Amino acid sequence: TEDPFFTRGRTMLVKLGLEKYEKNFKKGLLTDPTLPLLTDSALKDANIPPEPRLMILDHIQRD
């Protein structure tokens, strides 16, 4: 079930093949509760480059 840490985000990144950015999620406090609320600007603020950002947004917006 949903908890306030990072496990669901990590599983999502693994599926999307973007585990290298889990570090960015942790430093930017993009915890599991933020996942459905993520925005391009929030991801850009965590220093994630454009094409990876858009892969993640497309996913959390439609899934």
Numbering used by the authors: 191 to 253
From the study:
Additionally, the Gly241Glu mutation is hypothesized to push two neighboring monomers away from one another due to the extended glutamate side chain as well as introducing a negative charge. Crystals of the Gly241Glu mutant were obtained but from different crystallization conditions, after trials using the crystallization conditions identified for WT and Asp235Ala failed to produce diffraction quality crystals, suggesting a different packing to the WT SAM domain and to the Asp235Ala mutant. The structure was determined and refined to 1.89 Å resolution. While the overall fold of the monomer does not differ from that of the WT protein or the Asp235Ala mutant, the number of molecules in the asymmetric unit and the overall crystal packing did differ significantly. Two molecules are present in the asymmetric unit and the polar intermolecular contacts between the two monomers were notably absent. Furthermore, the crystal lattice no longer showed a helical superstructure. The arrangement of the two molecules in the asymmetric unit of the Gly241Glu mutant could not be superimposed onto two molecules of the trimer in the WT structure indicating a different protein-protein interface between the WT and mutant. Specifically, the close approach of the monomers for the WT protein due to the presence of a glycine at position 241, leading to a hydrogen bond between the main chain nitrogen of Gly241 and the main chain oxygen of Gly218 on the neighboring molecule is not possible when the glycine is replaced with a longer glutamate side chain (in the Gly241Glu mutant). The Gly241Glu protein eluted entirely in the monomeric form, supporting our observations from the crystal structure that this mutation disrupts the ability of the protein to oligomerize entirely. We determined that the oligomerization of the Tric1 SAM domain may play a role in protein function whereby mutation of Gly241 introducing a larger side chain at this position disrupted the oligomer and resulted in the loss of RNA binding capability.
Named Tric1 and Tric2 (tRNA import component 1 and tRNA import component 2), these almost identical proteins belong to the preprotein and amino acid transporters (PRAT) family of proteins but are distinct from other PRATs in that they also contain a C-terminal SAM (sterile-alpha-motif) domain. The mitochondrial outer membrane proteins, Tric1 and Tric2, contain a C-terminal SAM domain that is required for the efficient uptake of tRNA into plant mitochondria. In Arabidopsis Tric1 and Tric2 SAM domains have been shown to bind tRNAala via key lysine residues at positions 205 and 210 and are required for tRNA import into the mitochondria in vivo. The protein adopts a characteristic fold consisting of a 5-alpha-helical bundle.
